[PDB]
Amino acid sequence: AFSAPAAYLTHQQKVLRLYKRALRHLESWCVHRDKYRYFACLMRARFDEHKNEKDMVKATQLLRQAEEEFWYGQHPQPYIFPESPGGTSYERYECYKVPEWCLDDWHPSEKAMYPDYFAKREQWKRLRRESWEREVKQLQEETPPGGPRTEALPPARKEGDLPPLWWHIVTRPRERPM
């Protein structure tokens, strides 16, 4: 989510992703902790018996039969964490998230309540206003010609600088706003 993606997944990443998926589905099959521990140790032993192999061709022939075997026995109803994309509370609090800019449209009788909050908000706004003019040029000179090659962003390198394109990441609504 936070990390920028690459152009492709290497062989090691694919193997590790299979290992995690297989362990999770084995846990979903083996409900009890001791049974899961036993079969997960067995799966670890099965997984690293080809850990030391050198050639790419058969190492890719493995992890293909492994995917087929996983898809045959994949527990059609695996356990999902409730906040995960398949969980029972995935986007439950999405309706309570309100953008910050809505506060700019409040009535003055509403802003009269919470004066300290809005003073701090004005401070944040002026900080953003200066930092943006710096950030545009920083990104302009830090980018290779022909455009970006990866959607990864640089940090700030000067003293009073801020990381380019920081406002909408720092001012996230919240995980549970209401």
Partner: protein
């Protein structure tokens, strides 16, 4: 004068005052949920009086108070039928609603829109009362559609979640399919009986034909989630647990069975529709119990249990025992609502975790929920002298001794075994093992709201069957004499289901693992019915809606035929007429030609 009518109307009327006050200052404060809860408790206490009057004598009433309109020979008026069914169902619904509101005061404490949520619950209760007390088909349709709209609004409570909106639209779709049959029945009765009033319909229909009864059966199957139109009820578990306990467990989903019960005088004169109802109920209860047997979400297990119980109610209707079906509705209300409250208590205590894989030893960790769920599971399986006994045991006996399908009877017995099996599954995977939840233990039962709300329905699910059965008049011929093995059949199949489920669940501890079989995959994916039927038809509809109706016909061929052809022809004729070089040579040659033609053609 005769306080019966005044009391019956006052209950429904005072149910509406908090809706009027929803724009007052109380709605903006934190006392509104308690206001609604107190109003519902007062309404329950008031409605207890006409039930006593009917129990003493048998008081029955029709109140046609407001005249709405008159289409020539058809008079439509606001009429209420205060019969046995109404005066028996209103107290039960109000009792369950009071318990659910007290439970929600604890369950939804951190919800910002709890006042709106309480208001929504009261609106559903009002619509359901309108449905239950209606005397004509139009008022019944008003309640029918009101409960559906409230279900749509409460399923999609968290409107930022895509799945909730999908489930709400699914419920609307299936209930609209049932609404087709409802409208068919209304049109038939208006055209043939010249009435939507129930009395004239009963008078003029001594041998009811197939069409109106088939329409009524379609509507009942739609709203009670029978096998053809079943998946929306399990999908409706997207809503908050109080919604699942109130609407989609015990009160709203029995509306189709209630519709079939209201029209029972016409149903007993038709044998084909009775057989259709029997087969539909049997297949529904079997299929839903089979699906429930392998589920891992606890709310899904309870929802499939509700669907199988509704199928059993339809089986009871099919063998011409409507009062037994009403009694089963009343008992199921109690124990199913309490089961859902216990499940919601577990879910809240385990940080909104619903999978039974991640709940272990709760028998000692939270004892009150354990006892309540144990008593509810015993009541659901028809333990003798409990609330579910007095309906389920009689239903099983009646199906055993009747001239009916052998297949439907076998399916009913197998479904009873499967009911015992999934009750065993819930208990075994939620209470008996070692803990399997995250290390930060936040388990807490000590809230008086939760305890009292659960305890009232506990007392109900223990004693209500005895009280109600002993306080109602006999409405059918009993099955006094029976073979000994036939008398014990329900208990025998329940014990066999218990034993087989326990034996199969005890093998999960063995240190052996194997891949699942085809039957398990069929049971886990709900017979693959949601997959195919939610992917093949919808796609083939939507694709057509863009390719043929919109693009090929509307945007191309209808455009080609009238306007484009006219434009093309007129433009070509304009080019033909106006493209002249301006040479008098050709003009005067043409003049000569027309002069000759006029000379030699028009005379």
């Amino acid at each position: 004068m005769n306080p019966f009518a005044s009391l019956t109307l006052t209950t429904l009327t005072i149910l509406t005052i908090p809706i009027m006050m929803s724009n007052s200052n109380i709605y903006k404060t934190n006392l509104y949920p308690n206001y609604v809860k107190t109003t519902v408790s007062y309404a329950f206490t008031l409605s207890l009086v006409p039930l006593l009057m009917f129990m003493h004598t048998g008081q029955e009433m029709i109140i046609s108070n407001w005249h709405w309109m008159t289409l020539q020979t058809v008079e439509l008026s606001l009429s209420f039928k205060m019969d046995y069914f109404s005066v028996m169902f209103i107290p039960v619904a109000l009792f369950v609603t009071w318990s659910i509101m007290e439970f929600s005061m604890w369950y939804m404490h951190s919800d910002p829109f709890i006042n709106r949520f309480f208001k929504y619950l009261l609106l559903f209760l009002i619509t359901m009362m309108i449905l239950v007390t209606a005397n004509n088909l139009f008022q019944l349709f008003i309640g029918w559609e009101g409960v559906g709209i409230m279900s749509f609004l409460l399923i999609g409570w968290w409107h930022g979640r895509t799945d909730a909106n999908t489930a709400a639209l699914q419920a609307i779709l299936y209930n609209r399919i049932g609404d087709i049959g409802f409208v068919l029945s209304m049109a038939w009765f208006l055209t043939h009986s010249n009435a939507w009033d129930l009395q004239q319909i009963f008078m003029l229909n001594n041998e009811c034909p197939n069409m109106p009864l088939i329409g009524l059966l379609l509507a009942a199957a739609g709203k009670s989630a029978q096998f053809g139109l079943h998946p929306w009820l399990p999908s409706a578990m997207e809503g908050p647990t109080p919604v699942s306990a109130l609407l989609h467990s015990s009160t709203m989903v029995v509306a189709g069975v209630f519709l079939l019960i209201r029209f029972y005088p016409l149903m007993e004169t038709n044998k084909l529709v009775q057989t259709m109802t029997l087969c539909l109920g049997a297949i529904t209860t079997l299929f839903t119990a089979l699906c429930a047997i392998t589920q891992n979400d606890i709310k899904k297990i309870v929802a499939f249990s509700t669907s199988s119980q509704l199928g059993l109610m339809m089986v009871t209707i099919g063998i011409n025992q409507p009062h037994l079906a009403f009694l089963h509705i009343c008992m199921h209300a109690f124990f199913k609502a309490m089961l859902f409250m216990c499940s919601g208590s577990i879910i809240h205590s385990l940080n909104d975790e619903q999978d039974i894989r991640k709940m272990g030893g709760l028998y000692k960790a939270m004892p009150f929920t354990t006892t309540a769920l144990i008593i509810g599971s015993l009541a659901l399986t028809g333990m003798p002298y409990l609330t579910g006994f007095y309906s389920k045991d009689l239903i099983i006996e009646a199906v055993n001794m009747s001239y009916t399908n052998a297949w439907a009877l076998l399916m009913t017995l197998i479904a009873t075994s499967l009911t015992a099996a999934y009750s065993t599954r819930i208990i075994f995977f939620a209470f008996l093992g070692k803990p399997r939840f995250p290390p930060l233990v936040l388990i807490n039962e000590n809230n008086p709201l939760l305890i009292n709300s659960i305890k009232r329905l506990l007392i109900g699910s223990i004693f209500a069957g005895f009280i109600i059965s002993n306080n109602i008049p006999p409405m059918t011929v009993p099955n006094t004499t029976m073979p000994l093995y036939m008398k014990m059949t329900a208990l025998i199949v329940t014990i066999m289901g218990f034993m087989l489920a326990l034996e199969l669940n005890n093998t999960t501890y063995y240190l052996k693992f194997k891949y699942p079989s085809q039957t398990y995959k069929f049971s886990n994916m709900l017979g693959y019915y949601p997959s195919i039927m939610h992917r093949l038809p919808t796609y083939h509809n939507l694709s057509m809606s863009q390719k043929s109706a919109s693009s090929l016909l509307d945007l191309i061929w209808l455009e080609t035929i009238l306007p484009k052809t006219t434009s093309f022809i007129q433009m070509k004729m304009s080019i033909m007429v106006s493209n002249q070089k301006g040479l008098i040579k050709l003009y005067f040659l043409s003049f000569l030609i027309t002069i000759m033609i006029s000379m030699t053609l028009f005379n």
